[PDB]
Amino acid sequence: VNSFSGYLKLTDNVYIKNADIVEEAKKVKPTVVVNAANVYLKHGGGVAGALNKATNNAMQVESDDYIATNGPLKVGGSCVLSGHNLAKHCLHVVGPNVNKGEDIQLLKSAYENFNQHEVLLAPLLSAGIFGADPIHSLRVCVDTVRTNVYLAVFDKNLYDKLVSSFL
Ligand SMILES: O=C1CC[C@H](c2ccccc2)N1Nc1ncnc2[nH]c3cc(F)ccc3c12
Secondary structure, three states: OOOOOOOEEOOOOEEEEEOOHHHHHHHHOOOEEEEEOOOOOOOOOHHHHHHHHHOOOHHHHHHHHHHHHHOOOOOOOEEEEEOOOOOOEEEEEOOOOHHHOOOOOHHHHHHHHHHHOOEEEEOOOOOHHHOOOHHHHHHHHHHHOOOEEEEEEOOHHHHHHHHHOOO
């Protein structure tokens, strides 16, 4: 048992809710919140901009030191950093950005990072401003992640479409 509330169960291990991931994280304080990161960990907008804003920019300060030491992430890759006031840890995962021409095939590699964590609160990777089809992202998530994932979908119309179209 865990403290996630109000989720619809899609599969043995995947759950989904219409929720603002920032407010969800603040309430639950999960062990792991996933960020929709880019390779430079520049949290400007989308999920990343919202999560970083909620940390009063501490996520960005930490991220800038990480990049100065380690260089950029790979598309499809990840790193574990602090969750600040939102979670124990933040798993920054880079899904492909279709609006940059990045290979959508890398979405499966991106979701594979979730399997290193027993339980996660997450957005749909490559959705939103990353330009991929969220229905596809949900399918890849269900077919790739084997650990317990709680998906927060900000947009109510999209959430309803994802549920109603789920196979
Ligand atoms: O709901 C959906 C459908 C997919 C889309 C998405 C876009 C970018 C990254 C990851 C997912 N997206 N966005 C969010 N999903 C969950 N919590 C969110 N908090 C936010 C706060 C904001 F200022 C802006 C957006 C969100 C947001």
